[PDB]
Design an enzyme around this catalytic site. Structure first.
Site, mmCIF file in Angstrom:
data_model
loop_
_atom_site.group_PDB
_atom_site.id
_atom_site.type_symbol
_atom_site.label_atom_id
_atom_site.label_comp_id
_atom_site.label_asym_id
_atom_site.label_seq_id
_atom_site.Cartn_x
_atom_site.Cartn_y
_atom_site.Cartn_z
ATOM 1 N N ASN A 193 4.685 46.390 21.194
ATOM 2 C CA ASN A 193 3.674 45.339 21.190
ATOM 3 C C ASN A 193 3.241 44.938 19.768
ATOM 4 O O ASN A 193 2.219 44.275 19.595
ATOM 5 C CB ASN A 193 2.475 45.697 22.070
ATOM 6 C CG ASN A 193 1.891 47.045 21.715
ATOM 7 O OD1 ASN A 193 2.059 47.537 20.596
ATOM 8 N ND2 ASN A 193 1.262 47.674 22.682
ATOM 9 N N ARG A 216 -8.051 50.056 14.003
ATOM 10 C CA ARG A 216 -8.910 51.119 14.594
ATOM 11 C C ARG A 216 -10.383 50.802 14.300
ATOM 12 O O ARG A 216 -10.693 50.458 13.142
ATOM 13 C CB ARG A 216 -8.519 52.493 14.038
ATOM 14 C CG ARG A 216 -8.066 53.487 15.098
ATOM 15 C CD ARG A 216 -6.655 53.210 15.582
ATOM 16 N NE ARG A 216 -6.535 53.319 17.029
ATOM 17 C CZ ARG A 216 -5.396 53.551 17.673
ATOM 18 N NH1 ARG A 216 -4.271 53.701 16.996
ATOM 19 N NH2 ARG A 216 -5.388 53.633 18.991
ATOM 20 N N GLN A 261 -14.699 53.291 22.694
ATOM 21 C CA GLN A 261 -13.995 52.457 23.664
ATOM 22 C C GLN A 261 -13.952 53.114 25.043
ATOM 23 O O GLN A 261 -13.572 54.276 25.139
ATOM 24 C CB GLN A 261 -12.535 52.271 23.234
ATOM 25 C CG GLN A 261 -12.433 51.183 22.199
ATOM 26 C CD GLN A 261 -11.042 50.685 21.912
ATOM 27 O OE1 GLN A 261 -10.859 49.972 20.924
ATOM 28 N NE2 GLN A 261 -10.093 51.025 22.790
ATOM 29 N N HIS A 298 -10.263 45.542 23.886
ATOM 30 C CA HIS A 298 -9.001 46.061 23.347
ATOM 31 C C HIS A 298 -7.808 45.614 24.198
ATOM 32 O O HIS A 298 -7.448 46.321 25.130
ATOM 33 C CB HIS A 298 -9.090 47.588 23.231
ATOM 34 C CG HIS A 298 -7.969 48.211 22.454
ATOM 35 N ND1 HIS A 298 -7.612 49.541 22.626
ATOM 36 C CD2 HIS A 298 -7.066 47.692 21.581
ATOM 37 C CE1 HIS A 298 -6.594 49.826 21.816
ATOM 38 N NE2 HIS A 298 -6.232 48.715 21.173
#
Lengths: 374, 373
Positions: free
Chosen positions: A146, A284, A313, A332
């Protein structure tokens, strides 16, 4: 064997019964020539939702057809979760970086049968590699699956911040027109100075996409790129992040989180950026100090911030990045577009087929090879 | 002389006292080599808001310094507008395509002293050229001044539609996370087929910016580009728009409005597009049939639509493109970023300096000069 697979929730409207598009482009290789995943077959059409609980990464028919059991859940937090309950028995654990099942030393201690941990996506941030090594556990990821997705999300966010897209769209929905309100913060990207922290797979894909907007490109990397690459893309190398950010209009973070990068973007580093800098971070959450970002946007030191990574998260409802001025955040999601899911689901199956057939997993997928360990 | 200049209203929070940044990049020239505007001087800092009423395109002190009067208004509509009242007396009219002072035949007939009509920006769509020719009015525009600005807006819109940006951002605002809700409509752009209607200044700038996304590029244009250009960009040429849209995942319209493009994207043509196509239109509102677009988004024939051009403009409160599903519209703003404003304000001054000094206006700025195209 039991395969324990953690995935994110289905959409609140249920697993989709239809999609906007019938197919996605077939990607056969990545820049530099690594081939796209080569499982023997896939039991999905590229384009289907695979990363959520009812999507099952398209693995159930394959695994049950071999006589194995597949448990899929989104419940992954605490000693009392479905994940922890099912873990003692699991030979294989799979999760994505978008909804990760943390393999801490204590969980790995409890995971008596565990021999393979697969990241459906890229990275191994949620796995404790020291405990993996100690316990002979192979750790694999679907390398490059990705990277391009993230680089697109980055350039989208840069353009949206600089051009003041979201507030402009909001005037449309509110019934307004308000040209001057839209454009008193609207700039072109052209000829701005744009720099990346790290020039790995994502950083280099970002720089390639930025080049024809005629910006001047800068980077920092612990390992300076080859001269032929600098010349090709017209990159100015800086020996440090601080040196770089002093001259950038836009800064994008494409680096791992390690001691060198934790709280890198703090009050002091942000104060050295140009007034009205744009900061994008798909790397991050903790690389940018949460409150220093809020404070710089409130003062106008940063003109905007965007990205898709948060700490923690999922972000709590009261996370201050939700309400701070001039952000273009998403949850995210950048590496889990439907196109990326097709690749990492296919790579997950490729890895599993190698595992069950005792054939080597592709070298580029292997983070720790248990077969090399005593 | 009296200069009559129509500009849009200031922000509702008032003319800005400060900006998000101290400066903007200096643009020296455009692709293919045309230099950026070259006025002898400018009286603004590039980056200021120049295209609103209090910004005055940076012209007041220069014009008053020569003894001229400058009248600025946003009130431009109707036979009784400030604009229309001041027009009989004006030597020069200036407006931007984003808030255009229309110079219709009846308006030109009453503009007894008008000899120069400047577009602060690109084109002359609001000016009756026939009437201008008959009256010996020079018509000039700041060629190239915002072409790049538009091309960035286009690519930004393509990415946002394809990746499902706005609904994902809305989940953040709502206090949600909702990964699957965001991504059940999120795709990568890479390796999609993208085509442009026309490859002029804007459409070429768009193709160049899409190229490293690794999309497959297609175009239609009345004048086929040279083979070297097509090879360099990896373009497939198609002999009609219909031929091109049948294969594209994404279509972007970058063409002028004339009888060939009026209502071009209507129900029949949109029905020939791939199901779940994305259509982006920063060219002219009427190139797309208003209701056909709405119907296509309602049925899913189009997965998304975005653009910054509307019919009419400004968009009425009840315009249905404001509420149709799966859009990423903005108001008409792409060519009036602060960066573009710096260019077209400087070019407007350059033109005026040439005019008042009796020196030739650049050939590339002239649309009509002393009674002829």
């Amino acid at each position: 064997a039991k395969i324990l697979c953690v995935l994110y929730d289905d959409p609140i409207t249920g697993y989709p019964k239809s999609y906007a598009r019938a197919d996605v482009p077939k990607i056969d290789h990545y820049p530099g020539g690594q081939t796209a995943p080569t499982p023997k077959q896939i039991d999905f059409t590229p384009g289907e939702l695979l990363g959520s609980v009812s999507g099952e990464l398209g693995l159930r028919k394959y695994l049950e057809g071999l006589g194995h059991t597949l448990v899929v859940t989104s419940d992954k937090e605490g000693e009392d979760s479905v994940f922890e309950r099912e873990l003692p028995d699991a030979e294989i654990v799979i999760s994505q970086p978008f909804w990760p099942a943390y393999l801490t030393p204590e969980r790995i201690a409890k995971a008596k049968k565990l021999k393979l941990a697969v990241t459906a996506g890229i990275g191994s941030d949620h796995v404790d590699l020291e405990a993996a090594i100690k316990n002979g556990i192979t750790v694999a990821e679907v390398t490059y699956s990705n990277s391009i997705s993230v680089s697109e999300h980055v350039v989208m966010m840069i353009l949206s911040l600089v051009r003041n897209y979201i507030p402009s769209y909001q005037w449309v929905i509110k019934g307004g027109w308000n040209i001057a309100d839209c454009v008193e913060r609207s700039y072109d990207l052209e000829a701005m100075h744009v720099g990346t922290v790290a020039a790995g797979r994502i950083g280099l894909a970002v720089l390639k996409r930025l080049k024809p907007f005629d910006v001047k490109l800068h980077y920092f990397d612990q390992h300076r790129l080859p001269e032929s690459v600098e010349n090709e893309l017209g990159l100015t190398y800086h020996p440090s992040v601080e040196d770089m950010v002093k001259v950038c209009d836009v800064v994008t973070i494409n680096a791992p989180l390690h001691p060198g990068t934790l709280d890198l973007f703090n009050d002091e580093l942000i104060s050295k950026m140009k007034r009205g800098a744009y900061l994008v971070n798909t790397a991050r959450g903790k690389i940018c100090n949460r409150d220093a970002v809020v404070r710089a946007l409130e003062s106008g030191q940063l003109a905007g911030y965007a990205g898709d990574v948060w700490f923690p998260q999922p972000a709590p409802k009261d996370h201050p990045w939700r309400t701070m001025p001039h952000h273009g955040m998403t949850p995210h999601i950048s590496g889990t577009s439907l196109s990326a899911q097709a690749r990492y689901a296919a790579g997950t199956r490729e890895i599993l087929e190698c595992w069950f057939e005792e054939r080597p997993i592709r070298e580029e997928y292997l983070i720790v090879d248990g077969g090399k360990l005593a």
